[PDB]
């Protein structure tokens, strides 16, 4: 539901509104279904719909020197 503060309608709240039926995983993977405002959702294993925080690619660092 878009933009409702969701006191008036599992339940999760975010900048885009509140979505019902999705467990907020603290992890982060490649985006599957764009939800909005940096959060997006997928269907992953029991097998459930989850809504997590997008990733930007695996971190890296190059051993620069002179």
């Amino acid at each position: 539901y878009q933009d409702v503060n969701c006191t008036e309608v599992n339940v999760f709240q975010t900048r885009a509104g509140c979505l019902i039926g999705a467990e907020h995983v603290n992890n982060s993977y490649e985006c599957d279904i764009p939800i909005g405002a940096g959060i997006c959702a997928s269907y992953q294993t029991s097998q459930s719909i989850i809504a997590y925080t997008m990733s930007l690619g695996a971190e890296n660092s190059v051993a620069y020197s002179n």
Binding site: A37, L56, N60, S61
Partner: protein
């Protein structure tokens, strides 16, 4: 027979801004045209399916904007991080790299840009998919990669390389030998740093530098305002609000008046959406131009003249501004020049002698061969002159002597 070869250069840094996208909006037909009404909705029902392709077009525009930002910024696979000890030969990027001590991780020029640039009838604004800190992570990745790696992170794995050697190659790519860098490191460093500082001050003081972002926002708002201004006009009817028409009349003619309002508001919605379609087309053109600039300009040294700044091209750095990108192109410009006398060949033993790379200049009484973008003269030997023919057919040949490094050694 007169050639003018520059004897001194100057680095330059110039700003080019391109808008990427716009606001993702949406408008509900029934709530705008007949909000909280029953007779109005019944009358609107018999207009076929006009107000579903409106939402179709608007959703197309919104998802398109998300695609625009994605392809403009998300061209790096991993996320690189700049080294912990910054010793870049003398160059000072402290004004473009994100400062950790900042409250929000955005480098000072990005902060300057963010500061510089500044309803409820179903009108809804969906929020963008990417968020500004994610955009900051992308541009920091691009900057760290192009500072430690070079162009090699956009053609495979990212390979490290010092920074003075990277600029040695970036000169050697525009026909200037690299010894000019390795001997004017200090001068070039100072010109680089002072140029970036001037960029900060110039765009900070002058507030109309980035107008071609602000304009976008402005005009969008105007459209929306005009839209709501159409809910207070009576389009040739009795009044401008449904409740008064219903209360003060009967259905046999309330139907007619409501029909008039429906036609007027439907026409206003149609004009709004077609205008948005044309505007989105032009903004997509500029988004594709930004993507090409980021590919051929930020990830490589380009030769397409005046694509990447007036001058020969060296480097570029991206920064993000609200709904747009700003590039800082680092270019090279020759400054001080000098007259000389030029000659296309040198008949030495009867054979001509053309130069492999470099023109044949002279001051009053001595002939030298020098490269074509920096006065650096060497003596003429058989290591930079190749022979072809006999000295007849050229029009302009000039006698001289051409040294030979092997003669004195064989004369031991």
């Amino acid at each position: 027979n007169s050639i003018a070869i520059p004897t001194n250069f100057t680095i330059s840094v110039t700003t080019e801004i391109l808008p990427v996208s716009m606001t993702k909006t949406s408008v509900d037909c029934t709530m705008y045209i007949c909000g909280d009404s029953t007779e109005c909705s019944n009358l609107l029902l018999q207009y076929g399916s006009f107000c579903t392709q409106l939402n179709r077009a608007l959703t197309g525009i919104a998802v398109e904007q998300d695609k625009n930002t994605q392809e403009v910024f998300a061209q790096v696979k991993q996320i690189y991080k700049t080294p912990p000890i910054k010793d870049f030969g003398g160059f000072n990027f402290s004004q473009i790299l994100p400062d950790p001590s900042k409250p929000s991780k955005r480098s000072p020029i990005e902060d300057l840009l963010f500061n510089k640039v500044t309803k409820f009838n179903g009108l809804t604004v969906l929020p963008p998919l990417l968020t500004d800190e994610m955009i900051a992570q992308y541009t920091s990745a691009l900057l760290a990669g192009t500072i430690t790696s070079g162009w090699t992170f956009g053609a495979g794995p990212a390979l490290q390389i010092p920074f003075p050697m990277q600029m040695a190659y970036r000169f050697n790519g525009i026909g200037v030998t690299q010894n000019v860098l390795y001997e004017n490191q200090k001068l070039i460093a100072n010109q680089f740093n002072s140029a970036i500082g001037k960029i900060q001050d110039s765009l900070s003081s002058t507030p109309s530098a980035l107008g071609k972002l602000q304009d976008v926002v402005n005009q969008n708002a105007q459209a929306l305002n005009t839209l709501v201004k159409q809910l207070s006009s009576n389009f040739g009817a009795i009044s401008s609000v449904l409740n008064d028409i219903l209360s003060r009349l009967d259905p046999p003619e309330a139907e007619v008046q409501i029909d008039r309002l429906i036609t007027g508001r439907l026409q206003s919605l149609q004009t709004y959406v077609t205008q948005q379609l044309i505007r989105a087309a032009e903004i997509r053109a500029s988004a594709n131009l930004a993507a090409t600039k980021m590919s051929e300009c930020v990830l490589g040294q380009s030769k397409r003249v005046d694509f990447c700044g007036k001058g020969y091209h060296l480097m570029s750095f991206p920064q993000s501004a609200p709904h747009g990108v700003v590039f800082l192109h680092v270019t090279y410009v020759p400054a001080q020049e000098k007259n000389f006398t030029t000659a296309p060949a040198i008949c030495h033993d009867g054979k001509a002698h053309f130069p492999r790379e470099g023109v044949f200049v002279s001051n009053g009484t001595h002939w030298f061969v020098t490269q074509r973008n920096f006065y650096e003269p060497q003596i003429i030997t058989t290591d930079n002159t190749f022979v072809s023919g006999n000295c007849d057919v050229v029009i302009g040949i000039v006698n001289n002597t051409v040294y030979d490094p092997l003669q004195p050694e064989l004369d031991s």
